[PDB]
C-alpha cells in the first residue's frame, strides 16, 4: 500500500498480468475460430510476453513502464549487484548492531574500547531484561521494558554488571583485510563517540577525521569464546601478509620517543653519574638536568642464558638521561644497546619484533602499552611545534636559479643561431633544470639538517 490508498505493484505482478491477458486473448481467439493470421499474431505476442516475463531486455527492445524504465524481470532478481545472491544470501543485515563516530582515547588499555552508554543500553536491553528478572527486580517483560525506559539507576548497575567480560566486535567499512574486524572488552563512557586505542587504530587503516565504525555484539557463549580466543586484538599482533608486527606506533608516539632519546653536545648537568635510572628520573623531574644531557649511569640488564634463566649483569654505561628513563620501562631480557640510540619508527618496530621473539606475547603487550603512555607524555612535555621561521630557505637558491636561467638563455640563443634541433634544445633545458633543482635540494638539506652550537 501507499499514501492516499494507492498501491505499488511489483513489476513481476504486471508481467504476470500481461502474460495472463495474452493467454486469455489467445484462448478466446482460438475457441471462437479466429482466422489464421490473427491467432498467429496473438501467439507471437504471447511468446514475446513470456520472454518479457522471464528475461525482459534479453532480446531486442526491453519492455518499459510509465516511468520509462525497464521492468525488472525474474532474471533481474538474481543477476547483478542488486541481485538476491549478493544482496541477501551473502551480506545480510543484522540485529544487535550500532554505528558511531570514532574518537581517540589514550587512557585505554590495549584490549578495551570505549563504548557510549546509550548504545550499550540499547544493544544489551535483552540481556538486561534477562538479568533484571533473574535478580527478581522485575517480574514480567512489560515491567522490565517500562523500568529500562525510565532508566531507574538500578538498570545502570545491572548494565555495569552484565558487560564485565562481554567482548564486542568493531568493524570499519571497507573491511579490506581481516584486521578490519576486531574484538574488544568494552568500557562505559558518557557521550556518544566510540573510543579506540590509537595503536590498533593504525592497523584499522582508520583515521579520526570523521570515520564511522560499526559495533556488533555476539550472542551465544561459544560465539563470545571465539571472539575472545581468536579475534581479541591482543592476539592479532602479527599481520598475515608478513611476519612483521602490525601494532606499530606513529605520529606523536614516535615523535616523543625520538625527542626523548636524542642527545645534544651540551646540556644542563652534563657528565654527572647516576647510581640508577630512578635517580635519572628524579633529576629530570626536579629540573636539575635536561633529557638530552649525556651522562654515565649504572644499569642492570639480563639475558636469556643457555638454560633459559634471565642471568643478570650490571655495569656503567654512557647514555642520556632520556635513554635511562626509557630503559626503566623495558622488560627484563632485552639488551640495553637496543635503546642507546636515536629511536625512529623502524627502530621501535624492530624493538617490538625482538621483544615478541625473545619473550612471550603478554610481556610484549604490556611493553606496547607502556611505550604508548610514555611516548605520549614526553611528547606533550616536549612542546614540539612548527613555526614559519623553521622552514629556512637556503640563501644559495637565488644564485643557483640565476645560474640555471643563464644556462637556459644560453641554450635558447644557441638554438636561435640554428646550431641544434629543437628537440635536443628541449632535452638540454630539461636536464639543466633538473640538475639545478637537485643542487637546490642538496643545499636546503645541508643547511637545515645540521647546526653549530658552543660546547
Amino acid at each position: 500500500p501507499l499514501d492516499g490508498g494507492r498501491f505499488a505493484t511489483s513489476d513481476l505482478n504486471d508481467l504476470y498480468r500481461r502474460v495472463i491477458n495474452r493467454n486469455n486473448r489467445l484462448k478466446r481467439l482460438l475457441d471462437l475460430a479466429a482466422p489464421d493470421i490473427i491467432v498467429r499474431n496473438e501467439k507471437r505476442m504471447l511468446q514475446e510476453a513470456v520472454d518479457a516475463l522471464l528475461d525482459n531486455g534479453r532480446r531486442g527492445r526491453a519492455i518499459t513502464g510509465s516511468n520509462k524504465r525497464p521492468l525488472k524481470s525474474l532474471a533481474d532478481m538474481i543477476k547483478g549487484k542488486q541481485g538476491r545472491f549478493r544482496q541477501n544470501l551473502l551480506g545480510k543485515r543484522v540485529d544487535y548492531s550500532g554505528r558511531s563516530v570514532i574518537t581517540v582515547g589514550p587512557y585505554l588499555r590495549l584490549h578495551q574500547c570505549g563504548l557510549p552508554k546509550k548504545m550499550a543500553l540499547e544493544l544489551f536491553k535483552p540481556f538486561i531484561y534477562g538479568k533484571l528478572e533473574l535478580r527478581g527486580l522485575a517480574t514480567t517483560i512489560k515491567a522490565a521494558k517500562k523500568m529500562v525506559e525510565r532508566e531507574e539507576a538500578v538498570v545502570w548497575d545491572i548494565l555495569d554488571e552484565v558487560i564485565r567480560e562481554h567482548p564486542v566486535l568493531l568493524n570499519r567499512a571497507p573491511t579490506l583485510h581481516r584486521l578490519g574486524i576486531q574484538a574488544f572488552e568494552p568500557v562505559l563512557i558518557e557521550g556518544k563517540a566510540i573510543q579506540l586505542h590509537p595503536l590498533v587504530c593504525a592497523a584499522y587503516n582508520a583515521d579520526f577525521d570523521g570515520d564511522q565504525m560499526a559495533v556488533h555484539v555476539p550472542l551465544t557463549l561459544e560465539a563470545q569464546l571465539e571472539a575472545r580466543a581468536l579475534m581479541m586484538s591482543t592476539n592479532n599482533i602479527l599481520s598475515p601478509a608478513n611476519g612483521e608486527p602490525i601494532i606499530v606506533p606513529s605520529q606523536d608516539v614516535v615523535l616523543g620517543l625520538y625527542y626523548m632519546t636524542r642527545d645534544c653536545v651540551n646540556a644542563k648537568g652534563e657528565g654527572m653519574v647516576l647510581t640508577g635510572p630512578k635517580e635519572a628520573e628524579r633529576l629530570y623531574r626536579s629540573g636539575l638536568a635536561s633529557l638530552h644531557a649525556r651522562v654515565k649511569v649504572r644499569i642492570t640488564e639480563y639475558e636469556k642464558d643457555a638454560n633459559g634463566e634471565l642471568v643478570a649483569k650490571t655495569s656503567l654505561k654512557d647514555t642520556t638521561v632520556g635513554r635511562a628513563i626509557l630503559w626503566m620501562i623495558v622488560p627484563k631480557g632485552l639488551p640495553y644497546s637496543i635503546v642507546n640510540q636515536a629511536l625512529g619508527k623502524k627502530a621501535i618496530s624492530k624493538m617490538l619484533n625482538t621483544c615478541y621473539r625473545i619473550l612471550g606475547l603478554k610481556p610484549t603487550v604490556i611493553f606496547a602499552d607502556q611505550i604508548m603512555y610514555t611516548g605520549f607524555a614526553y611528547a606533550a612535555r616536549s612542546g614540539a611545534s612548527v613555526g614559519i621561521d623553521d622552514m629556512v630557505i637556503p640563501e644559495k637558491k637565488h644564485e643557483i636559479i640565476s645560474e640555471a636561467e643563464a644556462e637556459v638563455a644560453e641554450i635558447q640563443e644557441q638554438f636561435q643561431s640554428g646550431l641544434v634541433t629543437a628537440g635536443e634544445r628541449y632535452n638540454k633545458v630539461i636536464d639543466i633544470w633538473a640538475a639545478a633543482n637537485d643542487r637546490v635540494s642538496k643545499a636546503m638539506m645541508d643547511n637545515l639538517q645540521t647546526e653549530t652550537v658552543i660546547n
Binding site: S97, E122, A173, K192, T220, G287, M372
Partner: protein, 1341 residues
C-alpha cells in the same frame, strides 16, 4: 571615499595590485537567462515568442481553416512567495496567449478569408524565478543547475590505433545537431570510408553519395582529380602538371620539349620539378606500363557498334584500351593516387558498395533504419528527406551553423539549420584531407568547444515539446470536425504543456534540491556548472580526459572548487569574472595593451581568441605609465607560458583573483598551500553551519562584502534615506526628499524573516544592525542574516589556537577543546525540525485528531489542549505525544468467553487505538509553531479556529500598521509642501489632519500636489480594504490537501544543539578534526599573562599535508588580536581619543605601498569612538588571494603589536605548572562546525521491525534498522576460524523467523543456547528458481 556606514570597521587591505574592475553581480547568469526566457520580444528571437513562431501557425487543408498566434502575456501570480512556501503550492503565473481562428471560402484563391474569431487561451501555468534566482516548486526551494555540454557542429577525431592495435591510426568525423539524428564518417584498417546514422550500422559512403542526387562519374569528378591520356596507333601520350610528378620514382625515361631525360630508378625531386616547370612541359609520351595500373574514370562508348567497354572505377584493361582506341575514342580519363596526398579511398568504397543505383541505396538505407518491413521507393525517399531536411524533424541551431561554417572555413556565418549536399561533400573532403595528414583532429575537451546551456534554453525546449504535442492535438481537432461552431479555447488542452513543464521542474536530473547551510553555499550552488543531465554524460562512462584540467580553463572555470569522489571533474564552478557569451561559450575579461601602456579598456574573449593572442600574467609589475618594469615579461599564449618583449604583449589579465571561484577566493593565504588540501577546504567551507551569534573573521579576503550583499539572505538598502524606526522584526526608513518620486509616500518598510525552517533544518534569522536616526545609503545592509555581521560573511568563529601535541588527545587529526569554548556558547547552533500529522477518512471508520487517547497517562495529555494539539512554547522530550490522533480498529469481534476474559482483564481489546504523533527518539526541544490545513466542508476545531483568529488579527494589524506608517509619510509630505510658502502652520495646527489635506493654502501647483496625494490616500485606503478582504477570504478558504486526507496538522519543533565530543570541526585551509575531549579550563596550557589556550591542534599534520598557509594565518591572528588587545587597553584607560586616533592611523599606515591609504583626519571624534568600539575585538585584516601579505609585513605588524617577532611564545602546562622547553606557536584561527553532529549519527538496534519479502531487518536510521554485515566482513570472519559467530550472524540474528524467537527466549531466560534453522531468503531463492521453470530441490532428507 568610504560611505558613512562602511566607516564602521574599516578592514585593513594588504593588496598591492590595484583593482580596475569591480566583481560583477554574482547571480547574473541565472536572472538574465530567465529574463531572456520570459520577457517580451518583438523580433521573436528567444523565449516564448520564438517558441510559438517556431510552430505557429496551424493550418488544416480539408478543414480549409487556420489557427494563428497574435501574442502572449503572463498573468499575475495569485500567491506571494512566502505564501507559496507556507501552503506548498508552486510559485507560478498563468500563461495567456491571444489566438485567432480563420476560415476561408471554398473557392480559389484559398487565401480568401470569410470569418475570423479571436480569444485568449489559458494554455498553461509557468513557474517564476524568485528575486534570489531560485524557483519555488510545491513547498520546496529548487534551483536549476546550468549545464555544460558538447556544442553542435562538426568535429574530427582520431584514436591512436587502440581499436585495431596493429599500430595504424584511424580517423572519424562526426556531425552533432541541436536535435535530430547523428551522422559520423569513419575510415577503416582497410582504408574504406564508412558512414553511420545514430551509430546503427556500418555502410560504404557511396551509398549516401548516390542517395544524394549524384551519379558515380559525378562522384569521381567531384572528389578526385583527373588525368588525360591519348592513344594513336600504339603510341601513348599523357597530359601533365609537373608538380603531379612529385612523389613518384622515375623508373622510366621521361620526355619534355622533345628530349628525354630520367635517372632511372630514382625519385623525382624539386630540381626535377623546377626543370620541368621552366621547360613548361604540357604533354609527354609514356610507355604502356605507365598507363597500366590506372583506374578507368568513366564510361566510354564505341560508335562502330553502339557498345560500352569501360565502366566506373575499373582498372585499365589493355584489351579495352585497344578496343576503344580503334573505335575512335582516343582520349581516356583516369584518376590519380598519390600514396600520401590522393588516397583511393572513395574508389575502394565505390568498389565495395552493394548498391548499384540511387533507389537501391535508398531502400538499403531504409531497411537498415527500418528492419523487418518491405522497402518501397516512396518510403525510403520520404524517410531520407524528412530525416535530414525537414527543418522541424532536424535542426542545427544558429550556433550549430556558426560552428559548422567556421570549422569548414566558409565565409558565411549564418545559414539554414538543415544540411545540404554541399555540406556533406565538404565535410567528407575535409575528412579526406585529415586522412592525408594536411590537417589536425579536433579537441573536444577544449573549452572553446563546449557550451553552457542555462535555464532558459531548457525551459524553452520543454515548452516546445508542449507546443508540438498541442499542435498535434489541434491538427487532429481540425481534421475531425467542423470549424465554425467552436472556439479555440476548447481546441487547445493545457494538460500537455503543464505536464511537460512540471515534469521538468520536479523530475529532471538538473532540477536538484537546493542547499541552504549558509549564504556562500546558496551562491555556489546557484552558480554551479554540471556536465551531467540530458544530453550530457554519465559517471560510469566519464573517462579521465574529460575530468582533467584543460589549459583554457584558465580565467573561465575555477580549477579548485570541484567536488571530491566519483563526481570529480564533472562538476565545476564559474570563475569569478566569467560570463556567458550569447552563443554560450565562456568569456573572460582582459585589459587592452596599446604600445606598452595598458589602456584599461576592457575586452571580452573566448577560448579561441584567447589562444590566438598573447596575454600577460596578472602579477606583472607596472609603472604608473602602464609600462611593465621588466622587458622580458612572462606571459601565456597558445596554451604555453614564456617570456616576451614589451611590444609583443596583446592583453593583460584584469585582476589576480580571476582564476578562482568565490569559494576558493574566500580562503586567505591560498598562494601558500597545496592544491589537494585547498580543494578539500574550499569544498568543506560550503558545509559550515550558522552559529548562534555571528562573528567577523579576522583574516578575511575582502570578498565577504560582495558575497554577503549579493546573496538573498541580507536585506539591502534599495533606497537611500534615514532610518526612522526599528524593532526586532520591522524596519521603517524615511526616504530623503530628492530621492523620492513625485506622488510617493517617501517611506519604505522591510519585514525580516524572523524564524523559519531552512532547507537543511538550520535556522534562518534576520537581525537588524542599525539604530534610530542613523543615515543609511543606497546599497547599505540594514539587517544581517545567518552567518553575516555588518554585511560581511561570518561562517565561522575566532579561536585561540596553540600548535602542540598534547597527551594523544589530538592524535591523528583529533581536536582538543577547552571547556571555556562550550561555556560561552561559541559554537552553539539552533535547529528546526518539522513534523506532520495526517488525519484520514480511512475505511472501517474515519481517523480523527483528538485529545481522547486510550491507554495513556493524563499528565502527557495535559501538555495538549482539549482538541489534541500541544500549546506553543511547551517543552517536549523523546517519546511524548505532540498531537493526539486516533484510528478505529474495525469490528474486532470477541466471542462471549473472550468478552468475559476481556472484562476480567479490563478495558483492553478496544476497537479504537492510539495513533498519535510522538517525539522522535532522543530528540527534545520547544514547540514554536503549529499549523493546520483542512479540507472544505469540515468544521474548524478549537485549535483551528483560534489560530485562524490570531492569523486574521495579525493580518489586520499588519495592514493597519502599514497604513499608519505610510499615511504618516504622506502627511509629512503634506507638511513639506505646505511649509514651502503661503504658510498657515499654526492655523493648520489647530485643524485636524483631514482639514490639512482638504484645505487649500494657495491656488497653484502646490494645491495640485495636495489633491494628488489626497486621491492617493483614497486609492490606498480602497486598495487596503480590498487587500484585507482578499486576505480574509484567502485565510478562511479551505485547502485541497491530498486524496483520502481530511485534515493535516504540522507542528514545528526547535532544538538548541551544543558542541560535544565526536562533533566535527574544521578550518578554512582544510584540516578536518573530530573533537575528542573537553577540558576543565584550568588544565589547558596558559601563557605568561595567564590567559589559557582554547583549542590545541596537532602540528604533525602540517608538513605532510603541506598546509603551510594555515600557519601563516595563525601568525596573522596573533598579530590582529594583538592590536585589538592594545587598543582595548587604550580604550579601557579612557585616555584622550587623539592618542588612539594617531595609533589607528599608524596601524593603517603600517603597510608598504598598500592600496588602502585611509586617513582619519576627516573622521569626527564620535565616529572615531564608534570605530574603536568595533575595533576593540581585534583589527580585521584583508588579504587578497594571490597578492597577499608578505612575511616582512606580518613581522612589522607583530612588532607594532609588541608580540614576539617569531610568533612563538613560551608556554606553561596548566596540569603540572611547569614550562615547556620549546617555544610554541600560539595565535588566532578561524574555525567552522561542519553539520555532522554526533547525535545525528549514533545509532543502535537491539530488535525492531522486519522486512516483508526477505524477512531481514530493515536498513537505515529512520527505520531503526541494523547495520549490514557486508560480504567483505564475511570474508574477514572466514579468515579467522570463527565459524560459530558467522553462523550466528547469518541464521539466528538475521533471518530465522523462529530461531531468533527461540534465541530471544533463551537469552531472557539467561541460557545462551542456539538453534540454527534455515535462512528464509534461501527459501525465497528456491521459490524464484522454481518459478523460472527450473526444478531445484533438496536431497537426503
Amino acid at each position: 571615499v568610504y560611505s558613512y556606514t562602511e566607516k564602521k570597521r574599516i578592514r585593513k587591505d594588504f593588496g598591492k595590485r590595484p583593482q580596475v574592475l569591480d566583481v560583477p553581480y554574482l547571480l547574473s547568469i541565472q536572472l538574465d537567462s530567465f529574463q531572456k526566457f520570459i520577457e517580451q520580444d518583438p523580433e521573436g528571437q528567444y523565449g516564448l515568442e520564438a517558441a510559438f513562431r517556431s510552430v505557429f501557425p496551424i493550418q488544416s487543408y480539408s478543414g480549409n481553416s487556420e489557427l494563428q498566434y497574435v501574442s502572449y502575456r503572463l498573468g499575475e501570480p495569485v500567491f506571494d512567495v512566502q505564501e507559496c512556501q507556507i501552503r506548498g503550492v508552486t510559485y507560478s503565473a498563468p500563461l495567456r496567449v491571444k489566438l485567432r481562428l480563420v476560415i476561408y471560402e471554398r473557392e480559389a484563391p484559398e487565401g480568401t478569408v470569410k470569418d475570423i474569431k479571436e480569444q485568449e487561451v489559458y494554455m498553461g501555468e509557468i513557474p517564476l524565478m524568485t528575486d534570489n534566482g531560485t524557483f519555488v516548486i510545491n513547498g520546496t526551494e529548487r534551483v536549476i543547475v546550468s549545464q555544460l555540454h558538447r556544442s553542435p557542429g562538426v568535429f574530427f577525431d582520431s584514436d591512436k590505433g587502440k581499436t585495431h592495435s596493429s599500430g595504424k591510426v584511424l580517423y572519424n568525423a562526426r556531425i552533432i545537431p541541436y536535435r535530430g539524428s547523428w551522422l559520423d564518417f569513419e575510415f577503416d584498417p582497410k582504408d574504406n570510408l564508412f558512414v553511420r546514422i545514430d551509430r546503427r550500422r556500418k555502410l560504404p559512403a557511396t551509398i549516401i553519395l548516390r542517395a544524394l542526387n549524384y551519379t558515380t562519374e559525378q562522384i569521381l569528378d567531384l572528389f578526385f582529380e583527373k588525368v588525360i591520356f591519348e592513344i594513336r596507333d600504339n603510341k601513348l601520350q599523357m597530359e601533365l602538371v609537373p608538380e603531379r610528378l612529385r612523389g613518384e620514382t622515375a623508373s622510366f625515361d621521361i620526355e619534355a620539349n622533345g628530349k628525354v631525360y630520367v635517372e632511372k630508378g630514382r625519385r623525382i625531386t624539386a630540381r626535377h620539378i623546377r626543370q620541368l616547370e621552366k621547360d613548361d612541359v604540357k604533354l609527354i609520351e609514356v610507355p604502356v606500363e605507365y598507363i597500366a595500373g590506372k583506374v578507368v574514370a568513366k564510361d566510354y562508348i564505341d560508335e562502330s557498334t553502339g557498345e560500352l567497354i569501360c565502366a566506373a572505377n575499373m582498372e585499365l584493361s589493355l584489351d579495352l584500351l585497344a578496343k576503344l582506341s580503334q573505335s575512335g575514342h582516343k582520349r581516356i580519363e583516369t584518376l590519380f593516387t598519390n600514396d600520401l596526398d590522393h588516397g583511393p579511398y572513395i574508389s575502394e568504397t565505390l568498389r565495395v558498395d552493394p548498391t548499384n543505383d540511387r533507389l537501391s541505396a535508398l531502400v538499403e538505407i531504409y531497411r537498415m533504419m527500418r528492419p523487418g518491413e518491405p522497402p518501397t521507393r516512396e518510403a525510403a525517399e520520404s524517410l531520407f528527406e524528412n530525416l535530414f531536411f525537414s527543418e522541424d524533424r532536424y535542426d542545427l541551431s544558429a550556433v550549430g551553423r556558426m560552428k559548422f561554417n567556421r570549422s569548414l572555413l566558409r565565409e558565411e556565418i549564418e545559414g539554414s539549420g538543415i544540411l545540404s549536399k554541399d555540406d556533406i561533400i565538404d565535410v567528407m573532403k575535409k575528412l579526406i584531407d585529415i586522412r592525408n595528414g594536411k590537417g589536425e583532429v579536433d579537441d573536444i575537451d577544449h573549452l572553446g568547444n563546449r557550451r553552457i546551456r542555462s535555464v532558459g534554453e531548457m525551459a524553452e525546449n520543454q515548452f516546445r515539446v508542449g507546443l508540438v504535442r498541442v499542435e498535434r492535438a489541434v491538427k487532429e481537432r481540425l481534421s475531425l470536425g467542423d470549424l465554425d461552431t467552436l472556439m479555440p479555447q476548447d481546441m487547445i488542452n493545457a494538460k500537455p504543456i503543464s505536464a511537460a513543464v512540471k515534469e521538468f521542474f520536479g523530475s529532471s536530473q538538473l532540477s536538484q534540491f537546493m542547499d541552504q547551510n549558509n549564504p556562500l553555499s546558496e551562491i555556489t550552488h546557484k552558480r554551479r556548472i554540471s556536465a551531467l543531465g540530458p544530453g550530457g554524460l554519465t559517471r560510469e562512462r566519464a573517462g579521465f580526459e574529460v575530468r582533467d584540467v584543460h589549459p583554457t580553463h584558465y580565467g573561465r572555470v575555477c580549477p579548485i572548487e570541484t567536488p571530491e569522489g566519483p563526481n570529480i571533474g564533472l562538476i565545476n564552478s564559474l570563475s569569478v569574472y566569467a560570463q556567458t557569451n550569447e552563443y554560450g561559450f565562456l568569456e573572460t575579461p582582459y585589459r587592452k595593451v596599446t604600445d606598452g601602456v595598458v589602456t584599461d579598456e576592457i575586452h571580452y574573449l573566448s577560448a579561441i581568441e584567447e589562444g590566438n593572442y598573447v596575454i600577460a600574467q596578472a602579477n606583472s609589475n607596472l609603472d604608473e605609465e602602464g609600462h611593465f618594469v621588466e622587458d622580458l615579461v612572462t606571459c601565456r599564449s597558445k596554451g604555453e607560458s614564456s617570456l616576451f618583449s614589451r611590444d609583443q604583449v596583446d592583453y593583460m589579465d584584469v585582476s589576480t583573483q580571476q582564476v578562482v571561484s568565490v569559494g576558493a577566493s574566500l580562503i586567505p593565504f591560498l598562494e601558500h598551500d597545496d592544491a589537494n588540501r585547498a580543494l578539500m577546504g574550499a569544498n568543506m567551507q560550503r558545509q559550515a553551519v550558522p552559529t548562534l551569534r555571528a562573528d567577523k573573521p579576522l583574516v578575511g579576503t575582502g570578498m565577504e562584502r560582495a558575497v554577503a550583499v549579493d546573496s538573498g539572505v541580507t536585506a539591502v538598502a534599495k533606497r537611500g534615506g534615514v532610518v526612522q524606526y526599528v524593532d526586532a522584526s520591522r524596519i521603517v526608513i524615511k526616504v530623503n526628499e530628492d530621492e523620492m518620486y513625485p506622488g510617493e509616500a517617501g517611506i519604505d518598510i522591510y519585514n525580516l524573516t524572523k524564524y523559519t525552517r531552512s532547507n537543511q533544518n538550520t535556522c534562518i534569522n534576520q537581525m537588524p544592525c542599525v539604530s534610530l536616526g542613523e543615515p543609511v545609503e543606497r546599497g547599505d545592509v540594514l539587517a544581517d542574516g545567518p552567518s553575516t555581521d555588518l554585511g560581511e560573511l561570518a561562517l565561522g568563529q575566532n579561536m585561540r589556537v596553540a600548535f602542540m601535541p598534547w597527551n594523544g588527545y589530538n592524535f591523528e587529526d583529533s581536536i582538543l577543546v577547552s571547556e571555556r569554548v562550550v561555556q560561552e556558547d561559541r559554537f552553539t547552533t539552533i535547529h528546526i525540525q518539522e513534523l506532520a500529522c495526517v488525519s484520514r477518512d480511512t475505511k472501517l471508520g474515519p481517523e480523527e485528531i483528538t485529545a481522547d487517547i486510550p491507554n495513556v497517562g493524563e499528565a502527557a495529555l495535559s501538555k495538549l489542549d482539549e482538541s489534541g494539539i500541544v500549546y506553543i512554547g511547551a517543552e517536549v522530550t523523546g517519546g511524548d505525544i505532540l498531537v493526539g490522533k486516533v484510528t478505529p480498529k474495525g469490528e474486532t469481534q470477541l466471542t462471549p468467553e473472550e468478552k468475559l476474559l476481556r472484562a476480567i482483564f479490563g478495558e483492553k481489546a478496544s476497537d479504537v487505538k492510539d495513533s498519535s504523533l510522538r517525539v522522535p527518539n532522543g530528540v527534545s526541544g520547544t514547540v514554536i509553531d503549529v499549523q493546520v490545513f483542512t479540507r472544505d466542508g469540515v468544521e474548524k476545531d478549537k485549535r483551528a479556529l483560534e489560530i485562524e483568529e490570531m492569523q486574521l488579527k495579525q493580518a489586520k494589524k499588519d495592514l493597519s500598521e502599514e497604513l499608519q506608517i505610510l499615511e504618516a509619510g504622506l502627511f509629512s509630505r503634506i507638511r513639506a509642501v505646505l511649509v514651502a510658502g503661503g504658510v498657515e502652520a499654526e492655523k493648520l495646527d489647530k485643524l485636524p489632519r483631514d482639514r490639512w489635506l482638504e484645505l487649500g493654502l494657495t491656488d497653484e501647483e502646490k494645491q495640485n500636489q495636495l489633491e494628488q496625494l489626497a486621491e492617493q490616500y483614497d486609492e490606498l485606503k480602497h486598495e487596503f480594504e480590498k487587500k484585507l478582504e482578499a486576505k480574509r477570504r484567502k485565510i478562511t478558504q479551505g485547502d485541497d490537501l491530498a486524496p483520502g486526507v481530511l485534515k493535516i496538522v504540522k507542528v514545528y519543533l526547535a532544538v538548541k544543539r551544543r558542541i560535544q565530543p565526536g562533533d566535527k570541526m574544521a578550518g578554512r585551509h582544510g584540516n578536518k578534526g573530530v573533537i575528542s575531549k573537553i577540558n576543565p579550563i584550568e588544565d589547558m596550557p596558559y601563557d605568561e599573562n595567564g590567559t589559557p589556550v582554547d583549542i590545541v591542534l596537532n602540528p604533525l599534520g602540517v608538513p605532510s599535508r603541506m598546509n603551510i598557509g594555515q600557519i601563516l594565518e595563525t601568525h596573522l591572528g596573533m598579530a590582529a588580536k594583538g592590536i585589538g588587545d592594545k587598543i582595548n587597553a587604550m580604550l579601557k584607560q579612557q585616555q584622550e581619543v587623539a592618542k588612539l586616533r594617531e595609533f589607528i592611523q599608524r596601524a593603517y599606515d603600517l603597510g608598504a605601498d598598500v592600496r588602502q591609504k585611509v586617513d582619519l583626519s576627516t573622521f569626527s571624534d564620535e565616529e572615531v569612538m564608534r570605530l574603536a568600539e568595533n575595533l576593540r575585538k581585534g583589527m580585521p585584516i584583508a588579504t587578497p588571494v594571490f597578492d597577499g601579505a608578505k612575511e616582512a609585513e606580518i613581522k612589522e605588524l607583530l612588532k607594532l603589536g609588541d608580540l614576539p617577532t617569531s610568533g612563538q611564545i613560551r608556554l606553561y602546562d596548566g596540569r603540572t605548572g611547569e614550562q615547556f622547553e620549546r617555544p610554541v606557536t600560539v595565535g588566532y584561527m578561524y574555525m567552522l562546525k561542519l553539520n555532522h553532529l554526533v547525535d545525528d549519527k549514533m545509532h543502535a538496534r537491539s530488535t525492531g521491525s522486519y522486512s516483508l519479502v526477505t524477512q531481514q531487518p530493515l536498513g537505515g536510521k529512520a527505520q531503526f534498522g541494523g547495520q549490514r554485515f557486508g560480504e567483505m566482513e564475511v570474508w574477514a570472519l572466514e579468515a579467522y576460524g570463527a565459524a560459530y559467530t558467522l553462523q550466528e550472524m547469518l541464521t539466528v540474528k538475521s533471518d530465522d523467523v523462529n530461531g531468533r524467537t527461540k534465541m530471544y527466549k533463551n537469552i531472557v531466560d539467561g541460557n545462551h543456547q542456539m538453534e540454527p534453522g534455515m535462512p528464509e531468503s534461501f527459501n525465497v531463492l528456491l521459490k524464484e528458481i522454481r518459478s523460472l521453470g527450473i526444478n531445484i530441490e533438496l536431497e537426503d532428507e
